[model samples]
Target: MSVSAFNRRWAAVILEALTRHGVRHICIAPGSRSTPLTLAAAENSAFIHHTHFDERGLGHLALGLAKVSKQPVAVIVTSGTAVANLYPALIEAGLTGEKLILLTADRPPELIDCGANQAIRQPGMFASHPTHSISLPRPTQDIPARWLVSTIDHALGTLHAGGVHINCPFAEPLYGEMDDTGLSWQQRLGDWWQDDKPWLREAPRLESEKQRDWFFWRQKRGVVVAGRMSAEEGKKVALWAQTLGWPLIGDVLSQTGQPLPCADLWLGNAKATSELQQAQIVVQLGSSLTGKRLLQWQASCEPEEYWIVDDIEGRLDPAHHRGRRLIANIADWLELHPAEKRQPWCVEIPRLAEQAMQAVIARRDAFGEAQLAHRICDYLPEQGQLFVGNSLVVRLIDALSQLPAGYPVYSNRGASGIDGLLSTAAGVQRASGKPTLAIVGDLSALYDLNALALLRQVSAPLVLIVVNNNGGQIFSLLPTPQSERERFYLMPQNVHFEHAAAMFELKYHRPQNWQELETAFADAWRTPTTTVIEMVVNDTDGAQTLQQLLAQVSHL
Candidate 1:
């Protein structure tokens, strides 16, 4: 076979691998060197390819699809700046643990520094941010079958594990018609795709001794903190919590089922209560708890034992805390726990939680931030996912809605820097593949406008409801004086995303009042593409509402 045949064969192999791994979406920004890969990817009828001028947006678009589909979504682009354009979304995906496979075609390393067109040092560029990286070597006759198997295995492993990377050094001719006289690309690829199984092995289960110790220790005052389990996982955890007499604490992201029937013994203080210290064991599942005060509270506790359970990744608690990192799924661990019929505190605590929820929702003032938050929560569909931007949106939802009850509320609280609101929201949408509604302030939405560029090709509907109070109104609710605040802290911008929608070919709706907002939301949900609802609110009134709510909560 000639070099062109080899290139076609390799492209077919990779594309087939993606298909076998269940990737139905492929996002592309047109370029020269990537034509071969893109052409091969286009052959499959299941593949959905979206074209974008902005390479960064193209990457985010792929990231979004991979997210919602829960499959390894692939992106193809030509060399040079196109690869650089994917950096922002790649970093966001890495941080949030979204699976994204980036196929960047490049000039061979020998051509670099020689200043060949569209050539730059591209390999290993994102090694630090990605879970894995590989540079597929130019195929040679002597390369063993095991090596080819290993390369494909590594690609799937990295992606399935929720990581990102670059694959470079495909030798020319990168694009050419296959002779079809040599090895048929489909036959070779079919074997490669069909036989790749070792990459999906499950983790080893806990030994009998470890299970015995975990059972004995958890029997004595353990607290099961369910962070962000899915609806099914949350139910299993709830059942397990009932049997153990442990308190259930649900985070907004965990979708930890409604009313927490098993966990009525839950209470909320602005600070961590002393009850946390009484637990002999702490079993944490799902994402980290978002509240900073919660982390500070955990820092203060010296538990007898701490265990973190997750499936794909190791528990890396950033707060310098120590725990036994269990690599099994939380459901598996709970299956090993001794079962009991009922616990006394489980019934009592759930009643208290119901009372707390009633008191919070019964407030008659629709204008208060908490009330408004609750009202908005009522409008949100209980089945799909929710991505709340940082600042007032997240905090408001935290205080008002009993999230994880309606739907899992996801926020980028890991680094919690409000730098990438739109990108983070897109990532969550990509990871969950559900209809995502992101509630963000005008300023947060404006700052991350680049995130909207990817909306032109979004697979899932991403409805953005922007509370346009014109500026950073959350700062006004702070105790700090605002005499000179307008210029300093509230760096307001007047840009509306309606123009952004036109630019990106997305649907846009502006609603001024509550009734209008609800009607428009219904329409947007029916539309398959991305939709933005700009809510025009009174700036001063919004600020006053936030401040008043803080005062009320402070007094509580």
Candidate 2:
């Protein structure tokens, strides 16, 4: 059979396997080597395909879709740098357990190590970053079609966590007309063509905690902590915490139990921290806590028993506590049995939170970095969701912001890098079809400046609030040497985004003050088009405000 036809058939089967496993979205980047996969994705009506010129943005675009849709989002990219560009998003998926199927098209083995154009050692390219990376030999009938489909099943069988890369390579004559020359092989794939299910489907069920473990843990003065979790899981864990009347502390990623309302800040108060440390046990749901203060508090607590329950099968605790980790679905476990309401362990927890929040509200005045993080959620429309950027923005929000309950909050906090904020937001808006607000830092916006192209294509209202604090102002908060702080740490810039917005034909707004920001945000929500609001502030504004707040909250 011709290589082109075999490549096309292989792609069709791979895509079929993806769809059977609940993958409904595919993000494609422009490429010649990936023509087979691209055409297969185009012809498949089961997939909602997205496109981008840059493979990096395309990876993040798929990352965003995978995050919100709660399904395995397929990413199709050509060989060479196209495959390498997907590394960052793959790193995130590895850490956060976002389901992704990376269908990377490669050059045939004969073309490699011969100075061929757009070719690299494509096998084992991602190293250990992805959960599973399988490099299939170039398309040929020598490898029976049934083995192809079965191998795909083997890769996808355990795709509940991270990314699974199925490397596909094709020889010359990459595209051609259809032919019936290979039609004889159809009889071999018995029932595969007739059925909608995978060849060997995998069903994984988690065993919940023992009654003795829960009874022993719950009988003590325990704290229910929330980590980065999915939509309703946070609320489910929140219900558990509220019912037990325990001190519920959560990272910014956890949109639950109202989470002691700015627990990251109030935990700064030594007295309040001391009060919560008295708890004998810590029951943490989900993974990747976003608070340094919370981690510090956990370190000091040294609770007699620490339990982390998350769906991802990895050790997520950074505290190095001698504890137990449960790999289970967070919602199912927490919802298994009803609990009776109990009395509070520390009444001072809420009091400290209220006091710190009062201070936050009092200073929620102008367009400073801290103030932006504090009041950013206030402007969200009733239908609006959020995408918080990395670096200082997420840190500030983690410390100060009390996210709108029942509204989903998204961020690329797995690798916790700052590059893909806007594109991920674009992916989120496209998948969610909701009025989404993406709050990113200036450097992050500029890093993904090309993603503005993807953002302009969104039909839903997407308000990208670029908190341009002039540079990597997040570095100033750390203990960096001030001698080279500006040139090295901050990497200061004098650029702005008004013209960038105009060039893209997106609605542009530069809010000068808090009131102006409110006006621009409201106007952006009033329309269905993508809008760019640049919240320019002094570089040190965020670091300084954060420093002062830490002092204030610490002394409260």
Candidate 3:
């Protein structure tokens, strides 16, 4: 069909609104009803359209762009199931507070409930997530200037606050040829360009003063727990740690700055050790940090004070039993507290932690599988990110890899399911625009191979360092090791990833020893493509070594 008059005006108005609000990136999934919007966006030189077959990935791609750019990135899709596919990313973004604009084309309201082909209820499907949802009343003969302007206003508002907007119900005749006569379509959108709301520009206010008062009064040693913070926040958190002489700990979602000498003191298993009572105060930030043992230990200890700092309020502290909620931004709290170099407490914990780390590194080779993790972490990049898959690898890193306090590392610890390691790593790599390396086991890697398709759409380099220990190595670490090992524990397939790599045109290599693996990693880091390094280890030796290492850590 030829381009319709209605679509031409509708496209012109929407494009003008988008440009005025500073949306530079648009992600498109092929569709008919939405083709006009896609074509209009593509026609503009200022916008970059990222095409993807998976609507879910496309949604996340928009999320990654918006998160990194600190602005809204439009996600365009044809009606029906395409819009339905955007829900997962939307839920995640809504909870994480990422700026995402969802532009979905829908059939007019009357056509929705009638089971019209490819049409379903999309109007408020995302009600819980969106900052606002606008049904662009099907374009009329006389389109109101305010209606067009409102679209831009709502989009920008949602962008600033981190949410979504839905535009829908385009009338029949979805496409049309542009009026070749040099008629100015630019002026129509120009009218709304000047609207400004500086008051909305206020920086996120924080409650740092409250944090300061609680900090000084706490009696036991203090520990700062950071969940997922931006790179800039990480640096500031590192600085705060230095000034307070407190140990800084970060989880997969947040990273602390490096080159800071005090950073390595961050450890996830710190709460597991006997160090629980050592801290009088626990200041927590980020999305999550809760765990079973960690929470139990926190509950057991009667801390002097537990303060939680975040944009919202909740028990982010892993030790739900401890810590009072000090709802505010970490930045705001740091501002109010200023900087105070803590002396006695800061000097003690890190010194002990350093001793423990040094002993493990020195004795790792002498031990077995438990010590294998230490050897692996020794060669990882000093900066960038690490994605640890569940089962043994993540716990091993949690206990052993001494990340420099705020160095960014992530895991799907939320559900802690082993199903999506590759996909999650791909998401983190795309979102952060940093080199992402994942340390996963053989079974986890193979199970999530579908996630490998993400490599095609990747915007940054990724390294998958699969520790090939034959079977489910984590089974050996389980309590029912003997019985479970003989039965349900299956060590299938000795297939190398070279075939997979060739299929995807990615680099692939295998390393049998630590030195070879390290060298392979260096090469992977140097390259700008997806690289898979499979590390072959004897599962028997791995199991025995791990036990000895755990015993050694207990002694430390």
Candidate 4:
């Protein structure tokens, strides 16, 4: 076979194998080198293609789909710095266990490092960040066609989480003259072509142990903490907690909703904290929770028995509680053990939560970041979901907002950086096909300003709320001096989003007070286009209001 023919066939085989292995979405960037993979994805009707000019946003676009679908998503990009741009999203997938297939086009060895433009060391470029990496030799008949197929299966089979890098180095004649390029390879594929199945299908599911330490399970009063999990999983976890007669404290992303809202702030109340600290056991579901004070309590509570259960195998105990970590599907595990209903324990928790929630509601009378956080989730459509940005966005909502139980919420808390929030949200809405409201900090919005390009791809109404505090106001909660904090830490931006939104053909709103804020939400819900609502506030006011809010909760 000709070199170009071989290159085209290799890409076709790779993409087809992934499709059989459960890849429904493919994200690509504009590039000449990745033409083979691009054409293959375009021709393949099973895959929905998402394209972006920037590879950084492109990778995250795939990340969002994979996160929601819990299936591997293909990302095709050209060689050089294009591949490097995927590092941030790659690291996130590594920690959070999103399956990303990075199919990168590269130059052959002869051209690489020989002063060729756009040529960088493409091998192992992502360091150890990827779950697996493979460098395919320039496409040739020398390697068996089945070799590439099974290699794909092996690489993908190893992917319990994170990204897998497949570097395809192509020689000259990147394009071949053919509507299809896999005829010769099809002969090699044998009955595999006639068969509509993968060379190797998924292994059978394992049987989880239904046995529990019944002696110790019923005797202790434990708090069931729901971290980041799916809405379905979160609902089931909350139900289990309720049945076992325990208090459920969930993060915003937990989707367990107001089971225990304002737990993050109510911990400041000495009476409530003292009552909560009486629990001798801690049962946490999922991982990478969002709260500083809650983690502090985890350390100080020092429970007699601590158990952490999650779908991922990564270590999650930050408090070193000597807990048991179980790696299994959360829903599957919960189904194994059926518990008899018991009377609710720690009755004061609900009382304290209600009192603290009232305090949070009264503060919303004024227009501030704290007020917005409390009210952000109120205006979503019946089919709408939430995509919460990192930093203060998640924490503010966690501390203030009370979502309805089982509401769909999306987030990127694995790496927890302020990048790609918009792009990720755009990806989420595309996959979910639901109207979405994304709340992001101004600095984070500025960091990913270019991601506004993705809003056009989303057909559902998108309300992009920018909590513009002029800087990283989250740092203000620390005990550092104002001068030092202003100079080195809180880098403020005077940039506005009206122009940015206009550039992307999006509607923009600057809501200054309670009425305006309410008006913005109403307008966004009716409009089909992406709307940017810029809620500007003084940098220090958010943190100060939070402090006062906590003090008020304590007094209540």
Best by TM-score: 2
Error of 2 at 350 (Å): 2.0
Model 1 worst lDDT run, 10 consecutive residues: 262-271
Task: Report the error of model 3 at residue 158, Å.
Answer: 5.2
The residue-by-residue lDDT of candidate 1 on 1-556, one tens digit each, is 5776666556666676566566777777798777667777877676866666677767666655555455777788888999988887677667656677888888766788896888888888876876777777765545543455456665665453554565745677765566763265345334544563533333343332345565356557777777655556777876677677777776655666534321211234331254456666677776656544345555666677777776546555555556677655556666765556545343444554565555555663454344556566566754677777777666566545665443556665544545566765665566566777888888877766877865554447778878777788777755557786777777778667788878878788987556776788788877557888877666656556544444443333
User: Which residue runs of candidate 2 sit more than 4 Å off their true CA positions?
Assistant: 206-211, 257-259
lDDT, candidates in the order shown: 0.64, 0.83, 0.63, 0.83
**Candidate 2 structure quality by residue, lDDT tens digits, 1-556:** 6777767877787787787788899999988999989998999989888889988888899989888888889999988898999988888888888888899999999999999999889888888988888898877777787887778787777666899888988887877897864556645777777788988777565465644557556768889888888767878778788788788887778878465777777888878877876888888887677777887777777888788888888677777788888878877777654456888778787888988888888888756889888876777657768898988888888887888556788999877888788889998888888999888988898899999999888867898989887889878888899899889988877899998898888999997887787788778887778999988888788888878887888887
Q: Against the hidden true structure, what lDDT does model 1 obtain?
A: 0.64
Question: Global CA lDDT of candidate 4, please?
Answer: 0.83
* Model 3 C-alpha lDDT per residue in residues 1-556, reported as the tens digit of each score: 2236556556656765666566777788898888667877887776877777778667765665665565667888989889987876676566556667788988877787887898888778877677667767765546655566565665564343556767667656665565632123335445344543321222343333464454455334777666666656777877877677666655434556322111222222353345656777766666554322334444566667676777643355554645466656667666766656666464444555565566556666633345556655565565566766777775565455445545556655544555556765775676667877777888888876755676655655678877777778767766555755745775656766777777777788887655776677778778556788777776766655545544554444
Provide the lDDT at 9 for model 2: 79
- Find the 10 residues in a row with the least total lDDT in model 2: 204-213
Q: Which is the leading candidate under lDDT?
A: 4
Q: What is the TM-score of each candidate against the true structure?
A: 0.82, 0.97, 0.78, 0.96
